Design a binder for this molecule. Structure first.
Ligand SMILES: [Mg+2]
Ligand SMILES: [Mg+2]
Ligand SMILES: [Mg+2]
Ligand SMILES: [Mg+2]
Ligand SMILES: [Mg+2]
Ligand SMILES: [Mg+2]
Ligand SMILES: [Mg+2]
Ligand SMILES: [Mg+2]
Lengths: 153, 96, 57, 159
RNA sequence: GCAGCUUGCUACCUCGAUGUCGGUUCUUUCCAUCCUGGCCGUGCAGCAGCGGCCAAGGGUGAGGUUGUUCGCCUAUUAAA
RNA sequence: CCUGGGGCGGGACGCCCUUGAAAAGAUAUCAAGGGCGCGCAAUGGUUGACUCAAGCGGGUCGGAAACUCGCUGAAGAGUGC
RNA sequence: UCCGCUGGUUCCUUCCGAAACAUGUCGCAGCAUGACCUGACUUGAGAUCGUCGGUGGAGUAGAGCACUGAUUGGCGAUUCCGGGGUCCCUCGCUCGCUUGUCAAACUCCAAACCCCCCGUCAUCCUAGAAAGUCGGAGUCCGGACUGCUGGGGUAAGCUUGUAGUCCGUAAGGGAGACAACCCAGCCCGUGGUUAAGGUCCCCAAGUGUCGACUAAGUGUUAAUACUAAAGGGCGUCCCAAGCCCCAGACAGCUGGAAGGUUAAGCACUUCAAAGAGUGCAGCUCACCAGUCGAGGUUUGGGGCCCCGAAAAUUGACGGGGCUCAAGUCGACCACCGAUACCACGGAGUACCGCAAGGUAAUCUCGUAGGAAGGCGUUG
RNA sequence: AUCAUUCGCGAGGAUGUAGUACGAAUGUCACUGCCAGUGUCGUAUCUUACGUUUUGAAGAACGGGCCAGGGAGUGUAUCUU
């Protein structure tokens, strides 16, 4: 499961890349979306590598992301009670485990927004002018996206 | 000044490869096409009759009718739909 | 706490071997000092420096 | 007209001489010097250029003259074989008024050379290696590019 | 390669005007130094040259033609 | 009228092809190569029969210049410009 | 009078928001038509700005000589068409084998982008897809940055194109100032954290950490119209490889350059140790012996610095100043720092709902201009 | 913050203390008589006027010395929505 977070703005960005972002539902910086691992989404995330950061999120990171930055319709925070009344699992942690194990989805939750408006990264990040392999933050973090997601908790 | 003729800038659009120059395969000229079938426009430069523009070279046309030997194609040129008359020698079916 | 470092690096348009004897507190610090010294003496980043081994001596 | 004018490569290749008019030919006379028969020279070195530059035919002729004279005075007339690999194929045209109808007349030819492309190849004996190398050094001083010598044959024969 | 001190190229500023050449007057500036000061080389005997380096404190004038700039010519002058 | 100010020069003032033009399309300059303002009752249509350019070989002053026979020959010819 | 030419054209808010381009024009300071913007209406279910796979178009970069043309030698024959001192024989073209270069009007080859169509995912869509009809225009002086070695040009803050994004019409934060360079697209107030960039002082936060380099005040200048080259350096710091090398080299200190030749040196039988000879006929090196007693020399590839390096009012790393740095290089840590992001409260807008009200990550910038709603004077 | 453990060459990081004490704001109880505002001055940050021609205006481009009043989409006919 790619965890794609936007880290650069929409100024001086080409229309194809900006529409790629818009179909990914990433209109502003510090916005995260969780998407499956099919080749279609892999190509879409590859097209916007210079303006986002993506990786393979683990279950604990997604659990804390749902617990601290999940919003329903009307801008209402997600909690444990809504999860238990609209899913089969014991808490947000078990639902995150199910989502990582592929037998669940984020669309299982009724009314849940597909965009996680995250906080800016605590103690900054590595920079938006170099990729991950150049010492920056853009591009593919692999499993190290969870460190960046943790610092943007 | 430059010209505005129909064959303008078709040095390689309307050129045949070295080992397909000469007579073409005659089976390409009797390929019947159905209504609504998608066919590729790949112009045969040897057949000088019933040819579309070079500007439609490489466009997929939907067959909508027949006008004798040639076929009626609904071709797309940028943002407009065009009706392009082409004989079967210049068309080629799309395979799935 | 002395080390031998083997490898090659991009000395301009070419690649050159090296077995520069480097000493430090441990092996990772030896590798870091290898990268730092080559970035100093030749102005090349760590992508242009390849270390084949770090031999404890 | 200094070589800095027709030096940088920012234009496409103007070489089809059947669609142009009256190119003044190159002053470069020969392209082989020395022993043109002895293929048994063990130590062979080449002068390579390390930029993308257009060498005028007059520059090539001056470099060839200085290198050939140095090699003849160093290793004798038949103790070396020196090859100028590149022909000047590009036609250099100057806008000889103002900028109206600016496509100029051909005022000479030149050779467009890529980075690391050998200009002169010199084959010499073991003892005449240093003289050939130094003459090739003098040859590159008459060229508009930074040039470095590279050894073709007998790298172990020298060191 | 440098300078932007000649002619070009360009059309960025100015056409509800930035008074357009040359001279004169007065002040200043750069050194790529003509003389004055200090050195180095010489195919420097001396005298007098020739070439180069440092150096902008001072000096660098008077006259004939030409509207001239420039340039020529005259006699001085350390140099003009 | 266009015009690296205007004028002199030129017509990039109508039509046609190659490049420019960055492998769909489009793409400017007084950009580069240029051409056209016609010719033909056959230099047109169709059917049949053949294959051309240029070499090598044989043939008598018919020379290394003619015409003729064999071989090579997907085109190196011809198709008005 | 007329003018396509100049100047001026008077209140507020809200919604949306361009074009400086094509064709024709006695057309080039103008206009019409189309693209682009806006408002309304009809229509009734798909649309493609994006991804992945496939059926097709490639003839550009690159590459190459297989065609068209160029282009360099060598080797062996055109017994022939040709040039020269019994056509005795010289002999350049021409044809093959092996080399050396090319093309914008060359291609046996040949990408990455890209374009048409199909399937899938994705997004938009009955709160109205694509299509259609009508009302209103503005607009056809554009410019810049990043690419295309774009074309031309000696080059140009030159001129003329193309793809994207900007300024125009773009705030706020930062580069010293900066139309268009980076963050950023922005309703109001508060709190927090970050972006770009910076942390010696001017100035909030580092006289921060590790490993080296620079000795020149070099530098303290991302992009750039704002930044000097060729050439050279036994300046200094590195990597690698030949050669001599504790069976004793390199550089210094002791006996000789004695046989020879005056082949007028400077126009050997055989010895470890003496030439047809380095130097101001003795005056001097190359060379063997001894000697301190250990590295020496050559080449190649690199980093920084230096010479090359001269301009005009006194002056510009932004200034002070800075030398194991306050400079350069390879990494790292912590903090500072926006109106961005998060949160809270509030305003406006869009659509839906009978209404209460609901939704908005997928609403809030704005020139020419379209549309809507209001304030004011006189009657 | 402090303290403890551990890692890190080091600057520092991780873990726990602790999502604790705090924290915009929303209420309530004391306490106090000034506060909002107005004029001027100073300190800190930001801004080179307005309209126009302009690709680009603070321009060494054009307009205004200042103040008051006057000063620019109106009617007929016709066509269209
Ligand atoms: Mg005119
Ligand atoms: Mg090419
Ligand atoms: Mg930009
Ligand atoms: Mg804009
Ligand atoms: Mg700004
Ligand atoms: Mg408006
Ligand atoms: Mg304007
Ligand atoms: Mg009034």
């Amino acid at each position: 499961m790619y965890a794609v977070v936007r880290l650069r703005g929409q100024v001086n960005v080409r229309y194809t890349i900006e529409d790629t972002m818009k179909m990914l539902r990433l209109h502003k910086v510090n916005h995260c979306v969780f998407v499956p691992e099919n080749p279609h989404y892999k190509g879409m995330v590859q097209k916007v590598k210079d303006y986002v950061a993506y990786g393979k999120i683990d279950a604990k990171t997604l659990a804390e992301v749902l617990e601290n930055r999940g919003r329903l319709e009307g801008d209402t925070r997600l909690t444990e009670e809504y999860i238990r009344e609209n899913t089969d699992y014991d808490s947000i942690q078990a639902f995150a485990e199910a989502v990582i194990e592929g037998k669940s989805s984020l669309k299982d939750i009724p009314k849940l927004k597909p965009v996680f408006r995250l906080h800016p990264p605590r103690k900054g990040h590595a920079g938006i002018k170099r990729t991950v392999q150049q010492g920056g933050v853009l591009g593919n973090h692999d499993e190290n996206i969870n460190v960046l997601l943790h610092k943007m908790r | 000044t430059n010209s505005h003729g129909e064959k303008r800038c078709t040095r390689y659009k309307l050129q045949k490869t070295v080992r397909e120059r000469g007579i073409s395969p005659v089976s390409r000229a009797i390929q019947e096409f159905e209504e609504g079938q998608m066919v590729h426009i790949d112009i045969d430069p040897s057949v000088q009759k019933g040819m579309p523009n070079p500007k439609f070279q490489g466009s997929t046309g939907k067959v909508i009718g027949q006008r004798g030997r040639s076929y009626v194609l609904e071709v797309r040129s940028g943002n407009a739909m065009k009706e392009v008359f082409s004989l079967p020698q210049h068309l080629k079916p799309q395979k799935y | 706490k002395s080390f031998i470092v083997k490898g090659k690096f991009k000395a301009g348009s070419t690649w050159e071997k090296f077995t520069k004897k480097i000493e430090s507190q441990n092996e990772k610090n030896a590798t870091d000092k290898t990268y730092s010294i080559f970035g100093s003496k030749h102005g090349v980043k760590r992508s242009q420096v390849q270390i084949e081994s770090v031999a404890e001596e | 007209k200094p070589g800095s004018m027709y030096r940088n490569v920012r234009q496409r290749s103007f070489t089809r001489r059947k669609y142009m008019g009256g190119v003044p030919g190159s002053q470069v006379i020969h392209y082989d010097m020395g022993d043109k028969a002895n293929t048994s020279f063990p130590v062979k070195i080449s002068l390579i250029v390390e930029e993308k530059c257009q060498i005028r035919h007059t520059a090539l002729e001056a470099a060839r003259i200085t290198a050939n004279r140095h090699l003849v005075a160093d290793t004798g007339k038949m103790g070396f074989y020196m090859k100028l690999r590149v022909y000047p194929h590009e036609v250099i045209r100057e806008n000889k008024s103002g900028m109206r109808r600016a496509f100029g007349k051909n005022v000479g030819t030149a050779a467009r050379v890529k980075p690391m492309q050998k200009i002169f190849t010199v084959a010499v004996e073991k003892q005449n290696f240093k003289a050939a190398k130094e003459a090739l050094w003098h040859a590159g001083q008459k060229l508009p590019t930074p040039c470095r010598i590279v050894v073709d044959e007998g790298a172990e024969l020298v060191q």
